[PDB]
């Protein structure tokens, strides 16, 4: 497997490089391709043969290979370039096969949007069906990376938690959901629960109590 | 003493056409019916008893492919019955398919004409009873005219099959003419194989023996039982004698 | 340029098999190789194998070498990928991608759009629809949020509209989550003013075609 | 040290037909639908590492056209990827046209059968309402019979297209088999060109180097960057050494 | 002093197709109407005054087949008017037949369209008078639809004749290209015959005289009145002089 | 296997000619030779001649060499044998027979069924029908024999039935004899019980199609 | 012409050989074929190339050739084998032609059936037409070989006699007819005529007189 | 033999161009050359140029070399001659003529019939018809001559009949003359007896189709 | 250009030769053709290759070439042979081109026919349109060569005259027309005009006066 940086960052007009470290058997003696993947799209060919561009690809992207390492460079950076970037080559060594890099999430360094947080308690029909689901919904934040932490009264609870990966909305910000699955008894057992969202060194927290 | 591989030629003036070549005189042809002539025999090319490089043996009448020997006992032409008949067997089955395959033209036809048959009988209906009413006049007139448009159209198949017929012949005439050239060469190779160096290649389709080969020796070469070691030596000194 | 179309989403059990097709436009015979590349969420792509035109030679990634079979129907302009002995981690998006020449290599210039294969030990179940009532803990002076909880369904997808299609502006439907039970759950929220709350009537219309259930549920304080 | 130009052979028993030749075994063929088989690969002819004069390399699996080297470092088959793919690219586009061109048979057809469709629906009209009046009897009978005469006739196009289909295949099979023979020879000439007199022509599709040519030297001959002056001299003494 | 046999080449970029070969550049072609192009001239192959083995004389403009001499008096190209015109005469009569033979397509057609003509006139009858009665409605509708089925069907003949047209061209293009190669060789043989050993064969289509042959001598070789005994001796010493 | 069909029986005068055909199934062109072999009664077969396919070469037995002509219509898949200067001893059954290869030799594997040629100086004449009455010299206590004498007809064949077709069991029709006049004669007998003799009525129905005569004759003691 | 035995004989299961003597020009240097002919059938190929069998022919038949002589052998003999057997070869010597053997009538040595004999006198309508025909009809005898002798009163008459060759009936026995053509005057001139059938050393004789 | 048909008569102005065609029967492709040969009145023929089949090579007489263009439509079996920069002396009869071989030479075996080209500075004008009265200076005891003068027309031809077609025997129509004005004029005379003169009524019917004028004029003493 | 005799003459059955003088570049080294042209017809090929005849041409015509001169010979002369005869060859010298001879009018020496002459004065409608045309019409003469001369009173006038070339009529004689274009004033100015035809040394003259 080829080693990519997990992530790299820059602003509009600015420049950034994504590295790909391999070995003698792959990168060392084969050609390197680069691919771009937006959310919800198939990988699209950016570079092939170390530095060639397919038609449709502008001179803002370019590639280089040196020995066991290869590099993607992106100048004049734009908003649409925010995607995941994978390198690719031929690994002759094992049984011959095409290998991809782990991937690099590029972040075009937008106005920071503080997240808005909504918390619903279990519906009464759900408790009537012997189940209990707390729903914490987070929307309109940028950049799109948040951590979620739950609280039983005051002390954290880690069991029963399901959180999604943040996904970019229609309006180019990000969204995320978090569900805490409890028993109706655990639900009525406590005084209140809290959903705690931490985005860019800031903290938002909403609270709910068993219909008071 | 010398043996030659050759083939048949005769007084045939029959000409067929391949694709790359026209008016090619053959010894044996066959006349289908529509100007179509398929070669069955071979290129008619009549000529020190030469071989097959520049010669079709008119003096050879017992078959298509065969040998012309010459030893102490005498000389003469002799057709290879096995070879000739395999050629005839294969070509026959082919020529037949052509007659047999084109027999789909009528099989399918038998219907369009039991139907053509039913219509002009149905047309003679309306002609005899026609002795509102003239709405049925130009009605019948419309159908009779559609009957001609129908026959012209069916005949379009005859027209467009003409050309099926014409190409199949030209092509099968080449597969055939090639097929002969094959069998002829094969016979020469089969002989060249046995003789090896016991005989000299003249390059005209004949082999000059380095050892005297009587009639029996010749038959042995013909029926593929030539004993190379038997005459090996006497050819061997003879090659070095000179 | 060539367009690569792939068969529909698949749901399979562990141990079972799945066969996906890809049809190349034009042709039908191809003068280039085609490979199958898969992507599990949310990971990097993995090359599985490929097939050479005319020769029909196949090469497979050693990780899949053994339980993947790449075949081609040249007249149909269609190639196939069959993966057997399915495991839950075989759940992924699978892409067909053509190369530039007849030789499988790192360069794939055109890609299929991908089709989803889900491998789970569960079966097909309709969801339950619960209301996420507005209340006062959701009124930040001016607007107010309300929605629906679509719980325990399988498989994807599910369709959520509001007021039979009228409400659109100010409606967000969150991407699902995947619980440990092998079942999905999502939320759909509509953002509306505080004042219309008791006056206005809001109904969500959930549609889960795989199990043929349509649920409509009102949401009230 | 010696390099050979050759081609692919395999366990294919697929046979197609050209015009002058039938039952020709090819390595790669393709089956259209009506007994029509177009060659894609080449003549299947499996054989001191000989060249291409009397040999199809079964040991060569990486492509159609390529080289078999032998030096100090070792020996082995290696397919020319560029050559093989140009052949495959060209033949593919041709085979497709055949599938694509014959696609005028249906395009035009789509109409005769939305019309055939409209008629026997119009015929079922008159059969159900017919439950002066029998002037309409043999009237309908006349048309239904003309519908069969019409379909037989349309089917005449199927019959007469059979033969379109049959010849196109035989002919494209020759343009193809020729096309391979071309590319193969071109590769040999491209090599013969670079080597010049630095290598001896064996006449079997192989070149005997007068100088030791390592793996790198071989690649240089393959990718067309052979340095003639570099080895010129050492071949030159070697030619005169003997 | 030397004489060469050769042929014509020019700035033509015209390409036709035989069967085994496509995009063959010819000096003179002819454009029928349906993408059909028949070769009339010959393969366009422009090159120490070489002969015809690897050369089409662009400098020769007076005809198709001819000679390029070189003696004391000078050198120059000269077309054989007899040969060139026999070729042109024969090819013309052939090309004409193709135009003339395909003229059965209309002769037979003239009828299906005086009949097509009579029908849609008979159809406009019923459309204008139709301004029990609607039994005549779907009656007419049935016939008009059968008129389309009829035209599609007749047009099937156009479709199926396309292919008549296409093969005839490819084939006649080979009989033609072969025909030229024939006449060219015949001229060389006719010259080789007269000269015998009075001239050396270079093997490039040229003959090197062993005796000085002036312009008159050249004409004598051209018009077939070369006096072998006259120069016999002076060639004879010259062969042994060396 | 190949079936050889030959033309109908022939009757000819001395000095005249006859031409027989044979049609080979399949083909029509043949890849083997065909010979004509004749058999006079009651003698051994005689080979007459043959014809080679494609070459059309003919060889003839020296006995017939001179007045026999073997021709072939290859498209009709039909060969012909024409024998001229007919003599009375040319009366025989004539068979067409195919060989294994193109060469005429002693091996004929398939045979036509034979057609009869009769050479005589007489003409076509209807017969006369006489009764062969039972009597007492024919009653060996139990059964009794009676029949019909069909005298002086030409040529063969003749059809004899009893009671218009009813009587069959116990009916024998003897093969004809050939007199020195060049004319035929036969007998047909029916075996019946002694008791029914005077009570039962028996009639023979003779039919000689060549001269278009049908005779019915009663037989009574 | 090749010389065959006129006839050869044996019983069911038993064995028999039919010989064919020729000369150096025919049998001496050519291949020999054998043919079987039942009554009313075309010759059917039994043996070719000295000893080969066409398909359809069982191993009960077999052939051999020695120098100028050839031999057909038939073991496990059956009833259906009763036929005429001809040998055949190529006689190069004259002008080259195929020659057949004279033929051998095989007799599978059946229960001897004594013949039944019926004699009719001239019908009165026949005498009225100025002709006279005696008819002697012989049926149901085996083996199928009989001699016929006529008698004027007591002394034999040889003129006017026509006898058929014996032919096998439907029921696998043999039949024969014999006609004596007389003038009505010769007929009325004598006292009686006799038809005398001799089959296997036995004698049957019937008598007729001018309607007494 | 081959028939050569040429396009219709042409009238052109000085400085303008004219293009004439010739169509060879049979063919359409020709295996011989064709030349254009012109004849001014009343002079010897002049060879202008020719074209070779297949090669399409043209050679032109040096007198016309420069303003003549010979082209061929081989499929139409038609060749063309275009002469530009016309002068009045380009007025002539123009013939197409085929040669024996592909080479233009003095031997032209078949000729077209010729078509007329007239080059003048004038335009198309209808004529004026005047009577040429009999009188006494035209009566040589017995017969008497009378006619019509068709003055100042262009171009040729003109049609003159008598009594709408009745009078024919004894009618002469003289060939035209060409004045210096570029205009034509002719006379048509009918010879008739002296006695019928005052009794008989004679009318000439002139027809000049190019300008679409039909004039009928009586002729009286 | 090749030089021909303007004209040559002879009688029926008699013989005549038409010469063609050229130079070394044309006749000297090329083949000579001959053509016949009747009135109103295309040239028809008589001789080619110095002396060859196309089919359709009888042995009454024949050709010869000697050095720079060539000759057409016509024996057994007939009435139909009266035509113009042109020689033709290849002139290599300039730029290579086909050249024709000036032409020879052959005259088969017919019964001399004295010409008939008719003279009309200007019509009154023509004078009324301010024009005046005298018309002299000459018909039925042989041979077909006449000169025409006009007279003002007694003295000749040469201005305003237009004469045609004599043309052969339907009845195998010749015809000609002559027009004198005057002003009506010139016409009324004189006493009379005369048209004077001279044929074979004979003179015919008609006279007209301004309606007297």
């Amino acid at each position: 497997v080829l080693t990519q940086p997990p992530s790299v960052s820059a602003a509009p007009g600015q420049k950034v490089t994504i590295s790909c470290s391999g070995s003698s058997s792959n990168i060392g003696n084969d050609y390197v391709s680069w691919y771009q993947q937006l959310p919800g799209t198939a990988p699209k060919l950016l570079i092939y043969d170390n530095n060639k561009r397919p038609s449709g690809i502008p001179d803002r992207f370019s590639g280089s290979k040196s020995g066991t390492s290869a590099t993607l460079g992106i100048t004049g950076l734009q908003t649409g370039d925010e995607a995941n970037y994978y390198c690719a080559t031929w690994d002759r060594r094992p049984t011959a096969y095409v290998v991809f890099g782990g991937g690099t999430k590029l972040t075009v360094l937008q106005p920071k949007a503080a997240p808005s947080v909504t918390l619903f308690p279990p519906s009464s029909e759900e408790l009537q069906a012997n189940k209990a689901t707390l729903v914490c919904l987070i929307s309109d934040f940028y950049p799109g990376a948040v951590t979620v932490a739950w609280k039983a009264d005051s002390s954290p609870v880690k069991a029963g938690v399901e959180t999604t990966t943040p996904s970019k909305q229609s309006n180019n910000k990000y969204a995320a959901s978090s569900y805490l699955s409890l028993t109706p008894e655990q639900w009525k057992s406590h005084r209140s629960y809290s959903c705690q969202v931490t985005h860019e060194g800031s903290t938002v927290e909403k609270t709910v109590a068993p219909t008071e | 003493d010398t043996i030659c591989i050759g083939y048949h030629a005769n007084n045939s003036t029959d000409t067929v056409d391949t694709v790359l070549e026209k008016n090619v005189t053959v010894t044996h042809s066959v006349n289908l019916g529509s100007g179509l002539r398929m070669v069955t025999g071979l290129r008619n090319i009549p000529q020190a008893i030469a071989g097959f490089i520049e010669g079709g043996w008119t003096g050879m009448v017992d078959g298509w492919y065969g040998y012309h020997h010459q030893n102490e006992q005498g000389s003469g032409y002799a057709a290879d019955q096995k070879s000739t008949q395999n050629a005839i067997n294969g070509i026959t089955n082919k020529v037949n398919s052509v007659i047999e395959k084109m027999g789909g033209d009528p099989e399918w036809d038998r219907e369009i004409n039991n139907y053509t048959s039913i219509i002009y009988s149905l047309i003679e209906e309306s002609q005899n009873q026609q002795e509102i009413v003239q709405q049925q006049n130009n009605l019948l007139r419309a159908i009779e005219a559609q009957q001609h448009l129908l026959q012209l159209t069916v005949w379009g198949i005859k027209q467009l099959q003409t050309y099926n017929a014409e190409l199949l012949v030209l092509l099968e005439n080449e597969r055939t003419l090639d097929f002969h050239d094959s069998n002829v060469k094969n016979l020469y190779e089969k002989v060249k194989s046995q003789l090896k160096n016991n005989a000299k290649e003249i390059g005209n389709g004949c082999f000059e023996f380095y050892h005297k080969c009587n009639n029996e020796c010749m038959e042995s070469v013909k029926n593929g039982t030539y004993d190379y070691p038997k005459y090996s030596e006497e050819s061997k000194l003879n090659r070095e004698k000179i | 340029e060539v367009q690569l179309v792939e068969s529909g989403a698949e749901v399979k059990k562990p141990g079972s098999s799945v066969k996906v097709s890809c049809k190349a436009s034009g042709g039908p015979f191809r003068s280039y190789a085609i490979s199958w590349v898969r992507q599990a969420p949310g990971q990097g792509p993995e090359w599985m194998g490929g097939i050479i035109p005319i020769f029909g030679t196949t090469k497979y990634a050693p990780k899949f070498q053994g339980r993947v079979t790449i075949t081609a129907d040249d007249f149909a302009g269609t190639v196939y990928m069959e993966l057997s002995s399915l495991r839950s981690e075989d759940t992924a998006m699978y892409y067909c991608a053509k190369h530039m020449g007849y030789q499988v290599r790192e360069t794939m210039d055109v890609w299929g759009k991908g089709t989803t294969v889900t491998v789970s030990s569960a079966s097909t179940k309709g969801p339950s629809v619960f209301p996420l009532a507005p209340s006062s803990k959701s009124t930040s002076g001016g607007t107010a949020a309300l929605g629906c909880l679509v719980k325990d369904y399988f498989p994807e997808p599910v369709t959520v509209s509001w007021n039979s299609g009228a409400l659109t502006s100010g409606v967000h439907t969150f991407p699902a989550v995947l619980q440990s039970s092998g079942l999905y759950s999502l939320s759909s929220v509509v953002t509306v003013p505080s004042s219309s709350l008791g006056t206005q009537t809001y109904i969500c219309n959930v549609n889960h075609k795989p199990s043929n259930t349509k649920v409509d549920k009102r949401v009230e304080p």
Side-chain angles (χ1 to χ4, degrees), chain A, chain B, chain C:
Chain A
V1 184
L2 306 170
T3 301
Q4 284 185 255
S7 80
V8 184
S9 186
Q14 188 172 322
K15 73 262 88 43
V16 121
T17 74
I18 300 166
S19 68
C20 195
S21 183
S23 78
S24 72
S25 55
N26 40 70
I27 296 187
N29 293 293
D30 297 87
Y31 290 94
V32 175
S33 287
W34 287 93
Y35 295 90
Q36 174 186 61
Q37 187 179 35
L38 314 198
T41 75
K44 173 193 194 175
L45 178 62
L46 288 177
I47 282 89
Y48 66 101
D49 292 354
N50 299 340
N51 47 22
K52 297 180 181 177
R53 280 183 286 101
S55 17
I57 314 295
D59 52 28
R60 222 163 24 84
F61 296 92
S62 68
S64 185
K65 161 194 164 177
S66 180
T68 251
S69 290
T71 307
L72 171 66
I74 314 182
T75 70
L77 199 50
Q78 295 175 5
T79 306
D81 298 346
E82 177 149 351
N84 296 273
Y85 292 86
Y86 305 89
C87 51
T89 188
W90 184 255
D91 201 347
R92 323 163 158 275
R93 175 193 298 275
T95 52
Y97 84 113
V98 172
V99 61
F100 289 91
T104 304
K105 183 54 168 338
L106 179 154
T107 59
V108 199
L109 181 270
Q110 284 297 296
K112 172 193 171 174
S116 54
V117 177
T118 301
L119 180 56
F120 297 102
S123 57
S124 76
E125 24 260 288
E126 189 195 355
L127 290 167
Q128 181 81 347
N130 216 32
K131 295 179 184 177
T133 307
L134 274 62
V135 180
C136 183
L137 301 164
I138 325 164
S139 47
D140 303 332
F141 56 94
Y142 193 98
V146 287
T147 85
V148 185
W150 292 84
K151 296 284 189 176
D153 301 319
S154 96
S155 55
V157 281
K158 295 280 99 267
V161 177
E162 311 273 15
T163 307
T164 66
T165 57
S167 78
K168 191 184 283 286
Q169 301 171 139
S170 312
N171 53 35
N172 288 339
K173 294 166 184 175
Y174 288 70
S177 331
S178 196
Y179 306 77
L180 180 58
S181 302
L182 297 178
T183 75
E185 301 69 44
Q186 289 175 304
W187 168 237
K188 295 303 184 180
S189 153
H190 281 66
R191 91 1 179 240
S192 99
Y193 280 84
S194 293
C195 167
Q196 187 183 115
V197 186
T198 292
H199 169 260
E200 302 290 292
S202 304
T203 279
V204 185
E205 186 187 70
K206 296 309 189 70
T207 326
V208 287
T211 63
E212 250 220 0
Chain B
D1 295 27
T2 140
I3 184 75
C4 299
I5 286 85
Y7 57 93
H8 183 208
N10 59 20
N11 275 269
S12 178
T13 43
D14 279 15
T15 61
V16 304
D17 296 334
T18 62
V19 30
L20 286 67
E21 206 171 355
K22 305 283 182 184
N23 296 330
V24 193
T25 311
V26 310
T27 66
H28 306 85
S29 64
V30 18
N31 209 359
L32 284 296
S34 297
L36 307 165
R37 182 176 291 276
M38 229 176 305
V39 53
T40 290
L42 51 174
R43 242 176 280 258
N44 212 341
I45 311 176
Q47 302 157 144
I49 66 123
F52 78 105
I53 297 294
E54 69 291 352
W57 292 335
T58 357
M60 177 181 155
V61 300
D62 346 275
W64 269 347
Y65 327 116
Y67 322 80
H68 180 85
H69 64 100
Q70 171 191 350
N71 51 19
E72 301 301 315
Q73 303 191 242
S75 63
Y77 303 87
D80 197 323
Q81 303 165 148
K82 174 97 72 182
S83 322
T84 295
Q85 189 55 351
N86 293 327
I88 294 184
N89 292 343
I91 293 180
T92 282
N93 302 334
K94 178 207 295 184
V95 149
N96 292 154
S97 69
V98 185
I99 277 106
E100 292 178 31
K101 288 295 172 300
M102 73 171 270
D105 189 13
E107 266 243 344
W108 169 79
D109 266 350
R110 174 209 45 218
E111 306 192 56
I112 80 102
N113 332 252
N114 185 249
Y115 269 128
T116 306
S117 296
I118 278 163
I119 291 170
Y120 157 102
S121 145
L122 279 160
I123 287 174
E124 294 241 21
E125 280 224 46
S126 326
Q127 279 195 16
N128 285 14
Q129 304 160 27
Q130 275 185 20
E131 286 180 347
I132 304 179
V133 185
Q134 318 279 138
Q135 234 310 104
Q136 281 153 43
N137 227 246
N138 41 35
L139 231 51
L140 184 66
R141 282 203 301 259
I143 283 172
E144 295 187 279
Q146 288 208 345
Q147 246 326 106
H148 283 147
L149 232 182
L150 225 15
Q151 293 171 332
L152 265 23
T153 257
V154 162
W155 195 70
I157 296 168
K158 288 303 177 302
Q159 256 188 355
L160 292 153
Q161 261 174 357
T162 293
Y163 168 82
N164 290 23
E166 270 178 34
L167 270 285
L168 180 58
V169 171
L170 312 168
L171 268 34
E172 288 293 10
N173 285 340
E174 212 169 7
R175 179 190 191 185
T176 304
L177 280 178
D178 183 28
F179 172 56
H180 293 282
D181 297 333
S182 173
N183 313 343
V184 176
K185 180 175 186 178
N186 299 334
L187 279 178
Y188 190 83
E189 298 287 12
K190 218 158 67 184
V191 175
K192 182 210 184 84
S193 169
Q194 309 188 83
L195 300 180
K196 298 175 178 181
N197 57 38
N198 277 352
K200 172 182 182 178
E201 276 201 285
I202 300 185
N204 69 338
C206 306
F207 292 99
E208 182 178 75
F209 290 98
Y210 285 114
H211 69 82
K212 286 193 175 302
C213 193
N214 293 336
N215 286 338
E216 181 218 20
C217 191
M218 297 298 188
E219 298 169 352
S220 71
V221 182
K222 187 158 186 177
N223 64 10
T225 59
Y226 176 77
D227 200 328
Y228 175 88
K230 181 181 185 299
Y231 303 94
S232 156
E233 261 303 302
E234 65 159 314
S235 310
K236 197 204 94 265
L237 273 196
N238 284 328
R239 296 190 296 271
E240 71 187 334
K241 286 315 184 188
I242 305 173
Chain C
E1 204 170 28
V2 181
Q3 316 220 0
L4 269 14
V5 188
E6 332 184 25
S7 46
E10 298 272 356
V11 182
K12 298 292 177 175
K13 308 262 189 173
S16 71
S17 300
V18 61
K19 184 174 187 174
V20 183
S21 62
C22 180
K23 199 176 181 310
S25 64
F29 278 68
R30 300 159 292 94
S31 65
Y32 48 86
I34 289 190
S35 285
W36 287 95
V37 174
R38 88 171 190 185
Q39 189 171 9
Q43 313 236 277
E46 285 183 281
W47 180 81
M48 297 184 57
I51 192 171
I52 312 307
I54 311 311
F55 289 89
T57 313
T58 54
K59 301 193 203 289
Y60 308 106
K63 181 176 173 178
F64 304 103
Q65 215 28 120
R67 62 187 190 103
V68 61
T69 300
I70 299 170
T71 47
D73 193 331
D74 289 291
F75 279 97
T78 304
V79 296
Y80 302 86
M81 195 280 299
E82 183 170 35
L83 184 67
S84 47
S85 284
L86 294 175
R87 299 155 55 94
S88 62
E89 46 267 60
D90 283 322
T91 300
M93 178 86 66
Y94 290 72
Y95 301 97
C96 71
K98 64 166 286 288
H99 304 274
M100 303 188 157
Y102 74 125
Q103 281 186 339
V104 166
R105 256 175 50 182
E106 70 287 351
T107 307
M108 292 153 282
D109 58 330
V110 184
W111 291 64
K113 306 146 156 298
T115 196
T116 293
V117 176
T118 304
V119 186
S120 169
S121 42
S123 295
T124 154
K125 167 196 177 178
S128 308
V129 177
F130 305 107
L132 295 176
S135 74
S136 161
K137 279 291 308 196
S138 132
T139 297
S140 49
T143 35
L146 74 162
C148 283
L149 169 64
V150 182
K151 195 83 182 298
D152 298 328
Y153 67 101
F154 188 88
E156 291 266 48
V158 94
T159 288
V160 182
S161 68
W162 289 90
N163 292 335
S164 297
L167 267 190
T168 61
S169 187
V171 168
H172 198 356
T173 298
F174 285 79
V177 71
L178 194 49
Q179 287 159 201
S180 298
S181 56
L183 298 180
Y184 291 86
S185 295
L186 67 74
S187 302
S188 165
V189 184
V190 43
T191 292
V192 295
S194 287
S195 45
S196 62
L197 266 180
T199 102
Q200 202 37 251
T201 158
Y202 299 93
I203 293 184
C204 58
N205 318 108
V206 178
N207 210 343
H208 182 247
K209 199 64 180 179
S211 71
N212 265 323
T213 78
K214 302 195 181 203
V215 180
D216 292 351
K217 188 104 179 188
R218 66 181 58 255
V219 182
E220 291 162 349

